[PDB]
Short mmCIF file of C-alpha atoms in Angstrom, two decimals:
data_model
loop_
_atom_site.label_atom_id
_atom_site.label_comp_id
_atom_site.label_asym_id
_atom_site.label_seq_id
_atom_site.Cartn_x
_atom_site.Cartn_y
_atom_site.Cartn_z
CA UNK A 1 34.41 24.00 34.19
CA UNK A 2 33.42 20.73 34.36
CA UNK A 3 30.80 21.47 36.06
CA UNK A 4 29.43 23.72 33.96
CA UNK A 5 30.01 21.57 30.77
CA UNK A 6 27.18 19.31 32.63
CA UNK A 7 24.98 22.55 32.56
CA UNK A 8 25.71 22.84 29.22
CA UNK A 9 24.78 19.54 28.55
CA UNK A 10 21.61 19.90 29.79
CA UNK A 11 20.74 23.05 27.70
CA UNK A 12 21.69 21.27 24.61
CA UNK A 13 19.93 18.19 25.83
CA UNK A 14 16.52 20.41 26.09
CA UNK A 15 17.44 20.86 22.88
CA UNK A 16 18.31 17.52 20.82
CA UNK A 17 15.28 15.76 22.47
CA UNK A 18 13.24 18.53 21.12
CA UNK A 19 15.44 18.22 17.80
CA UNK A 20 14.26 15.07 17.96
CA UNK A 21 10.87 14.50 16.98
CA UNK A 22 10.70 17.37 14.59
CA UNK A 23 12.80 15.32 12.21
CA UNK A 24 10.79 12.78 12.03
CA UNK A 25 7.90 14.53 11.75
CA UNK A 26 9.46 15.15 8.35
CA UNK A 27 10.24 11.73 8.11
CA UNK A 28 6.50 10.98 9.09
CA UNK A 29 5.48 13.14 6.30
CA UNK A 30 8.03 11.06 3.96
CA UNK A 31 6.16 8.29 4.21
CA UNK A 32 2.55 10.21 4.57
CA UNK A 33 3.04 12.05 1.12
CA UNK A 34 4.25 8.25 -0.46
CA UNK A 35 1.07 6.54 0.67
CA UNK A 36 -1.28 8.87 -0.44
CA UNK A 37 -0.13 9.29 -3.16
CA UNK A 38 0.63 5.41 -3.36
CA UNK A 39 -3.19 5.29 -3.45
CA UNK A 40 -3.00 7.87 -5.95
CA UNK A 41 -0.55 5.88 -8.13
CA UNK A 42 -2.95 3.22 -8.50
CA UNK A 43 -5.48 5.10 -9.21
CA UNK A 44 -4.28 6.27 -12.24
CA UNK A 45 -3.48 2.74 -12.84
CA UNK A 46 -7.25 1.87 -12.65
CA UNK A 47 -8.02 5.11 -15.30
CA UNK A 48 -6.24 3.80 -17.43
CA UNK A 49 -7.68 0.01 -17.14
CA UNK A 50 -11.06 1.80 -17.05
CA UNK A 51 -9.72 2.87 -20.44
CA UNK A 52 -8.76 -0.60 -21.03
CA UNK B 1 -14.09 -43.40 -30.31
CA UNK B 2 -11.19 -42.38 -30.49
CA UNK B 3 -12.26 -39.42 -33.24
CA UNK B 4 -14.80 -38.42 -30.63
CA UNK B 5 -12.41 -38.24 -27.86
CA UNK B 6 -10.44 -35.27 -29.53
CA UNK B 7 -13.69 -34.03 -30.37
CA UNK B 8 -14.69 -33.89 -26.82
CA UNK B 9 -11.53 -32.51 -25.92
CA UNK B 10 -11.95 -29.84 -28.24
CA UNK B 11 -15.30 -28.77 -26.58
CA UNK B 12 -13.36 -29.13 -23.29
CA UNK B 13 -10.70 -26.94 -24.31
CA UNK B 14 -12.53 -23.86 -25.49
CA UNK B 15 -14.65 -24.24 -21.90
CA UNK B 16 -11.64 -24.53 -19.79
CA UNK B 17 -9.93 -22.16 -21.52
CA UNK B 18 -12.98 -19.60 -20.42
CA UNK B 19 -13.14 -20.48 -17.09
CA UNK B 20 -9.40 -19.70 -16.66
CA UNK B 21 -9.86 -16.04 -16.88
CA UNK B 22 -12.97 -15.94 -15.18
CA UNK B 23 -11.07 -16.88 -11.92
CA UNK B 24 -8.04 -14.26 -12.59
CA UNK B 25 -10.37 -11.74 -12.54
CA UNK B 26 -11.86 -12.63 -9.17
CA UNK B 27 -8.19 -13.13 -8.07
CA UNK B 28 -8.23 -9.46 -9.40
CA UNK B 29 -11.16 -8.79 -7.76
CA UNK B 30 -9.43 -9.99 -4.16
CA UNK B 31 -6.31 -7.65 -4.39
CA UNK B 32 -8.56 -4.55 -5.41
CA UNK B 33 -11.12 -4.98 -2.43
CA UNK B 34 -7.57 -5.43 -0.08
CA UNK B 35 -5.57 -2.66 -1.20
CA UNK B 36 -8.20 -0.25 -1.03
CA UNK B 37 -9.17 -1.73 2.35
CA UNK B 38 -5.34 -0.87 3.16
CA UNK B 39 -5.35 2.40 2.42
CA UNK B 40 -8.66 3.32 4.38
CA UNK B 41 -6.91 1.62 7.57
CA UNK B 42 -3.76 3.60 6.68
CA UNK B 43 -5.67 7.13 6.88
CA UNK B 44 -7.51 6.38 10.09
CA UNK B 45 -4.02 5.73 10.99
CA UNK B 46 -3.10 8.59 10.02
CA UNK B 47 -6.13 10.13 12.02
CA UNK B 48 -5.18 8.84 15.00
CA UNK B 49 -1.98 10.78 15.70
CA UNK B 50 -3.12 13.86 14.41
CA UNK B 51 -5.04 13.72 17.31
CA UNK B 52 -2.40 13.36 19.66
#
């Protein structure tokens, strides 16, 4: 049984370690999103200081 | 003398007083040419694992 809890382990290994990078992919994005849009945010700041 | 001394201080003062924003806004001017700089960098960051 043992043994086959290794098997097991493997098949859900396969798994997590492809789990794995997908989340932070989203994570990735996270960030990507709040830097462009970072640059964004100051650009509004400078439309309205152009306005100034 | 002494009358002219404030007198020269008061044509001091409005010149100084000038000058002091003059360098603020080249301050200014630093940041803006930086953070722009930053966020160019960032996207060919960005580029470069896209591409892996």
């Amino acid at each position: 049984l043992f043994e086959d809890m290794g098997r097991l382990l493997r098949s859900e290994l396969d798994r997590f370690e492809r789990e794995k990078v997908e989340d932070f992919k989203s994570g990735v994005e996270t960030f990507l999103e709040s830097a462009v849009e970072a640059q964004k945010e100051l650009i509004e700041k400078w439309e309205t200081f152009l306005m100034q």
